[PDB]
Design a protein around this ligand. Structure first.
Ligand SMILES: CCCCCCCCCCCCC/C=C/[C@H](O)[C@H](N)CO
Lengths: 245, 232, 235, 235, 60
């Protein structure tokens, strides 16, 4: 609706998660190097798309100096401002539910429990995608150790309809083309490791299927832009180099 | 406004004692269960687990109540004198019993309860013993990160959503009495009551059967039942 | 010492009692709390949160993402209703598994006004009027617009506002209703009809989907905590 | 007499309870105390006392007097570290059996800053610089000086001062760490490197020995008393 | 933007101070100063390039 300027990045309803604005608690605080909007890779919303999911701060691990501070320091905390952009014409119809889940633990694909690997559990800016059904992994010799989120189960054994208990925003193409959620730092500790722990999960679900006129196939872009807010790090040491394979 | 919400409060919602574990302890001539070690958690049962997982973070003082029920096993006319059960709390790091008469039962610094059968169920209270500022029902992360310089993938391999292997220790339950000529089998049921409960970040309730200590789901993934669209 | 008399009930364990107990870890320095966002002080706070309704529970649509979508169209039969469901916020299949219903299924009694928010997710070039009606119990469940008209109702213009809030006020013979199917504490019915039609121009989707959300109002209250039937454990 | 209700827990013996008991020797004239030197009011007072570290635990050196001596030399490889050990003051073999570690192994949780004092026991004609580094957990354990440099560190000139105090401040995600090996409450690493070298003149020993001591600071605290695993009894 | 009123879109307009590679991709231009411009809402966008220079004056 109005100008949204952070650092050196400006974006032309916005919901504050849990009514709490990001806030600070000698932590290293880059007021400019990290407090800015980083744009994730655009995804394509089609008529056969089940959904998308990203993990924060994992999605910003390779975003400018924020990732460098995240890997160099031991433990850091950061709020976020997520902005989802999806522009469509008056003749397009659809709705996206954008949910910011605290501790968005997801279910695996194998009978073995909690067997998902770090590489698969931390996809980065590409994120992942939900599925209509639960596909059980059958590669016993070389298990994929990847999540198997289910659209209507939200990937966590709960019903999608109740996901609105989480902070949420609905992009309904007939009325609005963008959503904005301001997430504070949510954790059981005032500050925690970012490389191993993800504080937030952004799930975008097509509540209503996309459609345009009488066209058989229609696809429109969705772009996610995340701004770290009041991010502070502590425990400076040699750089961490996670094995992503 | 005259109808109140005194019973919908978080304290009232958890003010009931929920069974979290059943432990079998047998006394017989010394492959055997003369002492049973049970790891402390509410995830062995679904009801209290589901109630707690309504939220993401919690902070509560616990109250444990032990109900012991003993019975004979194929006794003809062999009988036993009233038994005393030792329930010893072993926090992470402390030595664990290897037998029912091990030195660890001395309980020099490990708290223990000696319960006499036929008496009232043994009740004690525990404060908030969390390392962090609140309990984490859901942990979206690992405890180890696999690094490029790791010699093998197993160095950094860790269970997803697992924080610590030894969360809060175990309870070791034995029968202090020596073996009677006839076997006696007892079940100790542990009932956990949260108190002074505080919760944060509400979550939708579980809709499908639990499968393990995590959010994993395996079966019965079609909860909703058939109903007509325009049928009242 | 002091003469005492053991009253009946002694040596019993009532799981709902509130008695002081010895501390197994005395002089423990508990970790102090912090101001974590999202603190919840009442369970009815969760019920007040609107959550989507599985309005459509057909055999080929339930337990999917299609169970939350109700199809509207310009070719629909304007005489027949769009959707119909009883006002049972804990036993009705469409409301039982909602967050409100989930909280209610932990209690035996409920009392308060409900709030149903219907969101139209069609094109901005689609317009129409929808009649959303609540009928208190006692009479025939409205099978026609001429009947649903007679009960409480609201007209919702799709073009102007994409969301409509139908508030169902608390009207009950009893002070509390049961969270279980009971014809004595029956709550009423909710129905939807086409007031005029859905009108769309050319090059526009002629079929659209609407979503439903249910929430509790500030007057809502529950009573007599119990065990939910939704979660079960193999023994 | 007075009606009473026996609450659950009656007739139980909790070894950690604090109840009044009858005196078996009433009216006993206990011997009065005297002002004996060395009164201890807290167990953390003992932990605050510096005690030598078994830094060297090789097969042919452990459980001897050589396990407390770390050999320094002018002929040493300046690229390799002198000594390296994890910051686990109760589970690490080099710190577990220290007085600090002994006190910790009676508790489940610990929190506070540590203090490592390294004493050089060479000739007064020997000079050199030693880099003592603490690396918080999360990254690769420093295998080189260029890496350990990046973490907390101090440079220690042997010629000027024969002892150096490396203080490891309390930096933890959790308010308390466990006294048991746990990757979630991992504390970090401590490493030592040759900043320049050890330089000695002629007629001087070219090989020397350094000693290590560990202590707790005033901010140190422990929690959840437990039984130590160090002492065992044959049953 | 001089298109139809039925056309909508977002444009990322970025200024990158000198020193690094000229942005050949959105992932790079994102890292510098930038503004997002919604065509449907506003038909004109103002990208202000602030004065950031080592020297007090630049040559023409
Ligand atoms: C004989 C004396 C018995 C002493 C028993 C002390 C046991 C201490 C356990 C306290 C907490 C256990 C249950 C609460 C923790 C929850 O599982 C959290 N959500 C952890 O994820």
């Amino acid at each position: 609706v109005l100008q949204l300027t952070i650092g050196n990045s400006t974006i032309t309803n916005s919901v504050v998660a849990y009514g709490r604005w990001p806030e600070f608690i000698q932590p290293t605080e880059p007021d400019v190097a990290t407090c800015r909007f980083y744009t994730l890779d655009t995804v394509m919303w089609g008529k056969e798309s089940k959904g998308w999911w990203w993990k924060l701060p994992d999605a910003l691990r390779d975003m400018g100096l924020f990732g460098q501070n995240m890997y160099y320091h031991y433990l850091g905390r950061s709020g976020y401002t997520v902005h989802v952009q999806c522009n469509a014409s008056k003749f397009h119809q659809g709705a996206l539910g954008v949910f910011a889940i605290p501790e968005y633990c997801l279910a695996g694909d194998s009978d073995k429990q909690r067997y998902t690997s770090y590489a698969n559990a931390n996809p980065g800016e590409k994120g992942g995608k939900f599925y209509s059904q639960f596909n059980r992994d059958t590669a016993v010799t070389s298990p994929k150790r990847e999540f198997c989120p289910v659209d209507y189960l939200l990937g966590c054994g709960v019903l999608l309809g109740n996901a609105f208990v989480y902070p949420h925003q609905i992009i309904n193409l007939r009325t609005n083309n963008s959503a904005t959620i301001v997430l504070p730092y949510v954790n059981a500790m005032a500050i925690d490791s970012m490389v191993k722990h993800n504080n937030w999960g952004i799930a975008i679900l097509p509540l209503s299927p996309l459609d345009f006129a009488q066209e058989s196939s229609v696809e429109i872009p969705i772009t996610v832009t995340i701004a770290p807010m009041c991010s502070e790090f502590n425990g400076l040491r040699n750089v961490t180099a996670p094995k992503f394979q | 406004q005259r109808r109140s919400r005194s019973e919908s409060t978080i304290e009232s919602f958890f003010a009931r004692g929920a069974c979290v574990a059943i432990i079998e302890v047998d006394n017989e001539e010394p492959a055997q269960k003369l002492f049973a070690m049970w790891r402390i958690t509410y995830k062995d049962t679904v009801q209290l687990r589901r109630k707690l997982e309504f939220f993401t973070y919690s902070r509560f003082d616990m109250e444990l109540t032990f109900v012991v029920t003993a019975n004979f096993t194929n006794t003809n006319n062999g009988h036993a004198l009233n038994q005393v059960y030792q329930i010893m709390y072993i926090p992470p790091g402390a030595p664990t019993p290897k037998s029912w008469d091990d030195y660890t039962w001395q309980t020099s610094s490990n708290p223990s309860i000696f319960y006499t059968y036929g008496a009232a169920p043994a009740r004690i209270s525990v404060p908030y013993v969390g390392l962090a500022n609140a309990y984490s029902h859901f942990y979206d992360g690992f405890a180890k990160v696999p690094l490029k310089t790791d010699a093998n993938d197993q160095i950094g391999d860790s269970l997803y959503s697992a924080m610590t292997v030894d969360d809060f220790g175990v309870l070791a339950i034995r029968v202090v009495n020596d073996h009677n000529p006839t076997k006696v089998t007892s079940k100790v049921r542990i009932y956990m009551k949260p108190k002074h409960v505080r919760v944060w970040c509400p979550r939708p309730p579980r809709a499908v059967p639990y499968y393990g200590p995590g959010v994993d789901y395996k079966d019965n993934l079609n909860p909703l039942s058939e109903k007509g669209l325009t049928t009242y | 010492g002091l003469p005492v008399l053991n009253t009946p009930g002694s040596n019993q364990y009532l799981t709902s009692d509130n008695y002081q107990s010895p501390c197994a870890i005395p002089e423990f320095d508990v970790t102090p709390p912090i101001d974590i966002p999202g603190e919840v002080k009442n369970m009815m706070e969760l019920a007040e949160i609107d959550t989507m309704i599985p309005l459509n529970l057909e055999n080929t649509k339930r337990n999917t993402m299609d169970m939350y979508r109700v199809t509207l169209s310009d070719s629909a039969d304007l005489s027949q209703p769009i959707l119909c469901f009883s006002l049972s916020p804990a036993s009705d299949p469409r409301l039982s598994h909602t967050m409100l219903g989930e909280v209610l299924n932990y209690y035996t009694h409920w009392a308060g006004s409900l709030k149903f928010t219907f969101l139209f997710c069609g094109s901005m070039m689609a317009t129409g009027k929808i009649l959303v009606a609540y009928a208190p119990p006692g009479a025939q469940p409205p099978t026609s617009r001429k009947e649903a008209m007679l009960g409480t109702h609201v007209i919702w213009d799709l073009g102007l506002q994409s969301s409509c809030t139908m508030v169902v006020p608390w009207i009950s013979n009893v002070t509390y209703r049961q969270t279980t199917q009971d014809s004595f504490t029956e709550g009423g019915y909710i129905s939807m009809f086409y007031q005029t039609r859905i009108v769309v121009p050319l090059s526009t989707p002629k079929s659209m989907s609407m979503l439903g959300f249910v929430s509790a109002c500030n007057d809502f209250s529950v009573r007599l905590l119990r065990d939910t039937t939704h979660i079960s454990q193999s023994a």
